Amino acid sequence: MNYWWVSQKQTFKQEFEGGYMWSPKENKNGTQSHYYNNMTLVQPGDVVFSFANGLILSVGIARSHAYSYNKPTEFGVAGADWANDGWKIDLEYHLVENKIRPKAHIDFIRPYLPQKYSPLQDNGNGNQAYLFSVPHELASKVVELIGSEAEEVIFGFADTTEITTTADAIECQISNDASIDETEKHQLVKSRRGQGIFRSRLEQVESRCRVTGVQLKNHLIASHIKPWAVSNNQERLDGHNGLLLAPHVDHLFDKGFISFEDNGEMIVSEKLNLDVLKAWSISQGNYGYFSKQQQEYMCYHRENVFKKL
Amino acid sequence: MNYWWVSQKQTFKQEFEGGYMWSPKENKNGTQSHYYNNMTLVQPGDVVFSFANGLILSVGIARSHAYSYNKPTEFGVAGADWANDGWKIDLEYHLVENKIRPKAHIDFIRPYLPQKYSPLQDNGNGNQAYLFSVPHELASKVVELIGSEAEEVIFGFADTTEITTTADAIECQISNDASIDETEKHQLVKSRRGQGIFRSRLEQVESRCRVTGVQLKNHLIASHIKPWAVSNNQERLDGHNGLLLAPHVDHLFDKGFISFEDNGEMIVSEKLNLDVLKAWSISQGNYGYFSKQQQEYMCYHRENVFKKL
DNA sequence: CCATGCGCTGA
DNA sequence: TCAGCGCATGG
DNA sequence: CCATGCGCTGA
DNA sequence: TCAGCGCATGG
Ligand SMILES: [Cl-]
């Protein structure tokens, strides 16, 4: 997941109200702009900090790659200088109550500014350009300053969108892969959504939500332990590579907010606000023993899915 | 959603272990069979009752339309009579502890048996054929007899698969509609998953899971009130046509297990096992008041989504 | 009238 | 269990 | 050296 | 507000 700084002082209202980022393709003499170029490197699920009148107003999630769009008519005078031919990105705006003025924290920030294409000068004054790369180290500091409601937008949200993208790719490769017969194809694709032979088999091994106790099949999700995306065709359909979970536990476990030791002990990530568990009346503690086959898979989960610091 | 009866006395082990239904295409002399024909009318998410040794052993969900497949080699002698060229369906088997003997309920059932292609004779003896249509009125009686753990497989599970299918259709028609520009297309498609400008807007109106109290954006789902599927392009992107919900509340509300009055009072469906709410520590009662625009949408939900009997 | 078919019955 | 007896369906 | 640009300043 | 004044970047 990549981070971005978007200086929007001229047109922030229009871009937030429109739920978009927009720039020209080139500068007004036809020449290449690294800033406008950056538009084409923005991935769905990449975080974008909106900066205007010296303040960070939005922690944004990008919901598109840059697509060829003409200047917004609602820009008026404020964007008369910009070429009509432009890049547009759909940005999931998230307003933040705590709008940090970066300049006022420059002492903390400056060391994490990149040497070239910094959004800020060394005095902490914004550079005159539209879009800059934000190195993850700098990103982590901006986030620290804005506090909770920046972490809220990233962890188990924005940083899940690229995972989803990687899984979609794999689902297309399966559906065009001759090497696996039409039944395997069908049962692999269905196993992803927790359907087909995988679900049947899981129910043979487990009978209820390990955490909540619910046994009713219509209120349980057939989540994998080792995620579908990284599992071989054997493990994608293995009943032992699965847990029946209530949707909110599936949520917490799928994203690695909680995991389990081999002994059943719940492990809670530092990234999970304990308030969540209190609000959903979920206790820490032992949720029963795992089979040897299960413990193999639950280990991969701890080391690869479960969010560490 | 269509229901089906599949008589599997000869090959049930093989078909359940394989997570499939299979029949020949035709009878021994190339002649047409309405029963084998029925294979091609089976829709994903259609419910299929497995009948063997006079008992219903499975309430199945179909995970495929019928596809051209040769006889399973594991049938051996037991299926030597059947042509090799056959139909195959992927069946999500769900075993039931309460295995009803339909014959023993025949006096109650008989009137709801169809005139032609009944799976049962009037004495309640199974007919010698593989697959029969089950009309919804007869279906409702079988379900009544098997009790909860048939309802488990159907309500908010099997009957959601066909909804998903209808929604996918709509998402493809949007993406091929010349009349709506590339931004509308993108924001309608993303609004479905609770993403893009719809999410931004919803956050303007609502700030927390109405039920659980969770305020953290990474543990909240942007569910619509009036479902995406039947909302006009205005309502698909309306912030007032939405609720921020914890995943397990999104689950219960999106499928109509719970709804709300205009006053905030939770309404619990007859189809929701109250055990669920106790296990997830959710109380009935008032979950705060709705805006007038919200009350319009919440009403449609009560009458169209919220499961009544 | 005859043929075919994933049920049905245990001498 | 393996055969024989049905009934429902269709040529 | 010259050109360009979603910040910044103040009348 | 919007012209004019910077710095950052590149031809
Ligand atoms: Cl109102």
Author numbering:
A (entry chain B), B (entry chain A): 1 to 309
Article passage:
Modification dependent restriction endonucleases (MDREs) specifically target DNA that is modified, and are non-toxic to a host with non-modified DNA. EVE domains belong to the PUA superfamily, and are present in MDREs in combination with HNH nuclease domains. In all crystal structures, VcaM4I protomers have the predicted two domain architecture, with N-terminal domains of the PUA superfamily (residues 1–147), linker helices (148–178), and C-terminal HNH domains (residues 179–309).
Except for the weaker diffracting crystals of VcaM4I with dsDNA, the resolution of the data reached around 1.5 Å. VcaM4I detects the modification by flipping of the modified residue and accommodating it in the dedicated pocket, as most clearly demonstrated by the structure of its complex with dsDNA. The faces of the nucleobase stack against Y130 on one side and W82 (plus to a lesser extent P24) on the other. The Watson–Crick edge of the base (i.e. the edge that would be involved in base pairing if the base was not flipped) is engaged in extensive hydrogen bonding interactions. Its exocylic O2 and endocylic N3 atoms accept hydrogen bonds from the main chain amide of Q10 and hydroxyl group of T11, and the N4 atom donates hydrogen bonds to the main chain carbonyl of W22 and the Oϵ of E15. In the DNA stack, Q128 fills, at least in part, the space normally taken by the flipped base. While the DNA could be well accommodated in VcaM4I HNH domain binding groove, it could not be modelled in the structure of the full-length enzyme due to severe steric clashes with the inter-domain linker regions and the EVE domains. These findings suggest that all crystal structures of VcaM4I in this work show catalytically inactive conformations, which are auto-inhibited by steric conflict.
